[PDB]
Design a protein around this ligand. Structure first.
Ligand SMILES: Cc1cc(CCCOc2c(C)cc(-c3noc(C(F)(F)F)n3)cc2C)on1
Ligand SMILES: Cc1cc(CCCOc2c(C)cc(-c3noc(C(F)(F)F)n3)cc2C)on1
Ligand SMILES: N[C@@H](CCC(=O)N[C@@H](CS)C(=O)NCC(=O)O)C(=O)O
Lengths: 264, 235, 58, 235, 264, 85
């Protein structure tokens, strides 16, 4: 074989069913990257509410019709005002947690339509102005209500009082990539002719073992209608969509006074 | 035998040098008005689009770096004389270190900052850098801010920060000068920097960019119609 | 260097009780402070400092 | 793993080249008036401030040295012709050895004194030097004199000496010349000397300098207000 | 591992309570650098007065008030006129010795103040003129009396008859460094509310095993008030400070006629 | 809910002061009212919170039928419950 000896001392120089959680119960699931949520490994005492925070919280129901273009949420932003989980978030400097997301949508055998649910790590969205990275904290953290997609890019032509809001586009996924490839991310498809619910399990993903839960969002959830809703020969159709999220294996550290962000 | 996937590995996928910076430096008589006697470049991989697009296939990365420098010089006028071979100084300034304000200030003593002296006409310069990330991996995408506005803040500018940015100054800068004094004739020079990742690990694959880049972020402005026309029943 | 993405926190001091002195005693006093590192401290990526400069060569 | 202190060692702290000398040498037709045909530089590390400040963290030191020389040449006029490649001679003159009085005197025979001949356009010159201290370690600070005045002395100048100085001549000097004869056109050149300590040992740590240096000693003249303003109860 | 072979023959080319001493007795201590004074190792017969020179000598008492800015002494300069130690100093060409320094200052429970005592190797002070290193031998060796610090730099604007004297500054430690870092040197703190005395043990420190005691001073002692003196509601307060120094393990060599420096 | 407690009382003075404090922990500490009506104290007045309450040297009857206060009237030497201190 060919001979090789490394000269320098540095390595760089070298040549190259029912699910019950806590006091909540909901009656196949998808695990992101095949990794179940877990606590920090062996390699300041953390606080861990075993059941006061690891349970299912239900968000506000939304309506799906013939003109809906999609919805998106950010985690852990969406759960900032849910029981003691939010209190622990705002009373500590460092936090960590995984999630279990459950999407519910029921219809009849005479309806038709398909929804795509995508879980995206580090889901960064585009703005609505010539200025770059000018979106504000308040607009980037809607909370429980979340946001919506659009079919076109509407530039905010107002220099007097810029809105500083996102302008996602459905077929660009709001980030400049084609929607067809979004299936690279963890995903589920709800087809009304086969099923009525979707489930995803998300572990903690980040470049650090633990990070602030207030200034950084680890996950994004996007729901988009792949096929339009229809029902018999009716002009208008509307059905509800519900989202339920459960924290799992949550840890907090850095206890001090409480944080009170200015949301408008 | 059977076909192999040797060349589709991450290491093979990133085993090429890519340009990231073209920097102009001039040697001439100093004058009152603005000049390019020394240049300062902020380190980043987003100036170009090829290596950026290749890297943005993944969310997290961890690698070492190999840098190569190619220098090309030329004249500007033809009625002032000639010049002797020049020597170029390239200094790395990490965050917090003092920055030059002139081509011959004390900062060039480089007592602690690493520096390279290159002689024109020789082989292109080359160095290697290890992984210098504060965290456990580099973050190509960061959904968050560096400050959080508070209700008790006196004004709204205390907590204002750019979206999807970690630090104002990251990885420092590079300062390039010509050590030689000025000949009677002006001489221009360009330094091209080529970067090659090594010992690469990646996490969280991501769909590639489909529309032209617009700034360091994910914003898009123009040319949002990439796909062309074709018939449904046309081969 | 100063950077919000790597801020460290805050240090503060307060009176738990007040300072009590008897008669024929000074009512004002001075306090001193010291700082040091521990055995679990490390640094990285040597660089030049901004605390020394020069304008002319001898 | 756990964090290491590999780069905070003394050897790593002093493992960089630092400039200590910039010397000008000219090649032109000899004339009656003063010229720079040959230059003599007195060896010391106090000309600059970065390496000096780094070394003055300690009272005593013991190390070997690595010296590197970078040469850059240029023209001055444009109506006299051109020149061929030049050769530079660098000679080390220890104390007591004869010193040159012209660029072409017998002293350049360098029968015993070491010398380096450098060809312009080649790689920067380099040499190494061992520890050459008379005592067991170098003394960055010396609280004393070299002479003691006596009551029996005829005058007060017999015992007068500078404070905090050991020897009038220490470590000798370096003499640099251009071996080639003079072309019809003048050519200027600068030699930059970079010094790197190696195999370093230190003793008696000392607080660093806080105000600008003033001379070889510890004297201070101006800018005695380094610290800035800040609020007592302001974060 | 990486391969390396050294080519050149030269190493440089290679890539990189009561304490009683003698007939003196004084009724926790600090050892500088954790090294006790000792005689020269095995690696001209030296003279060694075992007890005629190794004993406590007391200097002149000084007064501490509300405007005092500090005091400094140089060793072995301060002991040049103390018994047979000075005679041995001036009758020999080479000398060596360590020291034990004891600082005494007593007050009442109703006083307050703090003193910092610092032992500095190779304590070089700054001048008082534009000329550099122009201080004279007589002014640089005050002796028992010692010198004092100042709160500002007073330039000696007199070219006719320059004084050639030091101009130390309290907050610059007289050498261009901040006082707060002087604790890097061996040090003691005398706080009137806890103690009344300080003790330091200094070994012999120099680049040579033995050196002249007349033209070179090995140690400097600096005393500075870290907190101002006060007493009840009185306008003026003064208390005494005393210094006692004991040579230890002293050796001399090079006997010839006696040396008589011209001190003014 | 269920819990135990650790109580720490701090009070500092000089050598020239004098005085003595008694701290008592009482299970089921029931206090007396301030009116002829019996067990008429209100929830809000019986749960002051962090501020707490104070004792008195005498019993001050609340002679106001129009708008009764419905507050406790503890007495120092009776411990506020009809027993000697
Ligand atoms: C992700 C990612 C990684 C990077 C670049 C990290 C490396 O940055 C550098 C560079 C480009 C050069 C030097 C450098 N070291 O020495 C020199 C010099 F000697 F050439 F000046 N340059 C040091 C660092 C940390 O940027 N984004
Ligand atoms: C402390 C301290 C240490 C020093 C410098 C000591 C080394 O001095 C030299 C130098 C700088 C160069 C040479 C030298 N030897 O050879 C050459 C030449 F060949 F380049 F000429 N230069 C020799 C000594 C002793 O200065 N202060
Ligand atoms: N600009 C002045 C100062 C030049 C100079 O020598 N500067 C010193 C510091 S005051 C230096 O180290 N410059 C960097 C270098 O040329 O190596 C001149 O050209 O004369």
């Amino acid at each position: 074989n060919y001979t090789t000896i490394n000269y320098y001392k540095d390595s760089a120089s070298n040549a190259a069913l029912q699910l019950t959680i806590g006091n909540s119960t909901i009656t196949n699931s998808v695990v992101a990257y095949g990794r179940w949520p877990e606590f920090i490994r062996d390699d300041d005492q953390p606080t861990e509410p075993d059941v006061a925070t690891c349970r299912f919280y239900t968000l506000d129901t939304v309506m799906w019709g013939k003109e809906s273009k999609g919805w998106w949420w950010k985690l852990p932003d969406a759960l900032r005002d849910m029981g003691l989980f939010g209190q622990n978030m705002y009373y500590h400097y460092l936090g960590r947690s995984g999630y279990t997301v459950h999407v519910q949508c029921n219809a009849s055998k005479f309806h038709q339509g398909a929804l795509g649910v995508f879980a995206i790590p580090e889901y960064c969205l585009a703005g609505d102005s010539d200025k770059q990275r000018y979106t504000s904290y308040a607009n980037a953290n809607p909370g429980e209500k979340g946001g919506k997609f659009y079919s076109q890019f509407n530039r905010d032509t107002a220099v007097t009082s810029p809105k500083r809001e996102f302008c996602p586009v459905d077929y660009l996924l709001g980030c400049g990539v084609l929607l067809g490839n979004a299936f690279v991310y963890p995903h589920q498809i709800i087809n009304l002719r086969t099923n009525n619910s979707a489930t995803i399990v998300l572990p903690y993903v980040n470049a650090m073992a633990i990070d602030s839960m207030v200034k950084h969002n680890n996950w994004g959830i996007a729901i988009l209608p792949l096929s339009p809703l229809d029902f018999a020969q009716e002009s208008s159709v509307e059905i509800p969509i519900t989202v339920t999220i459960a924290p799992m294996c949550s840890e907090f550290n850095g206890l001090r006074n409480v944080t009170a962000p200015k949301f408008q | 035998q059977r076909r192999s996937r040797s060349e589709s590995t991450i290491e093979s996928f990133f085993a090429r040098g890519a340009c990231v910076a073209i920097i102009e430096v001039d040697n001439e008589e100093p004058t009152t008005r603005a000049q390019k006697l020394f240049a300062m470049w902020r380190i980043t991989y987003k100036d170009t689009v090829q290596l950026r697009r290749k890297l943005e296939f993944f969310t997290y990365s961890r690698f070492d770096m190999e840098l190569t420098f190619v220098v090309t010089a030329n004249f500007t006028n033809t009625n002032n004389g000639h010049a002797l071979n020049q020597v170029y100084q390239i200094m790395y300034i990490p965050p917090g270190a003092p920055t030059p304000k002139s081509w011959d200030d004390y900062t060039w003593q480089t007592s602690s900052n690493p520096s390279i002296f290159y002689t024109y006409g020789a082989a292109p310069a080359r160095i290697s850098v290890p992984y210098v990330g504060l965290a456990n991996a580099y973050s190509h995408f960061y959904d968050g801010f560096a400050k959080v506005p508070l209700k008790t803040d006196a004004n709204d500018q205390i907590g204002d920060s750019l979206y999807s940015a970690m630090t104002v100054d990251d990885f420092g800068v590079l300062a390039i000068r010509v050590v030689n004094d000025h000949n009677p004739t002006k001489v221009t020079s360009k330094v091209r920097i080529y970067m090659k990742p090594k010992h690469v690990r990646v996490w969280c694959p991501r769909p590639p960019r489909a529309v032209p880049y617009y700034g360091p972020g994910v914003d898009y402005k123009d040319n949002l119609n990439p796909l062309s026309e074709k018939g449904l029943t046309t081969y | 260097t100063q950077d919000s993405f790597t801020e460290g926190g805050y240090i503060s001091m307060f009176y738990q009780t007040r300072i009590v002195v008897p008669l024929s005693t000074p009512k004002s006093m001075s306090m001193l402070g010291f700082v040091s590192a521990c055995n679990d401290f490390s640094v990285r990526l040597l660089r030049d400092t901004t605390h020394i400069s020069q304008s002319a060569l001898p």
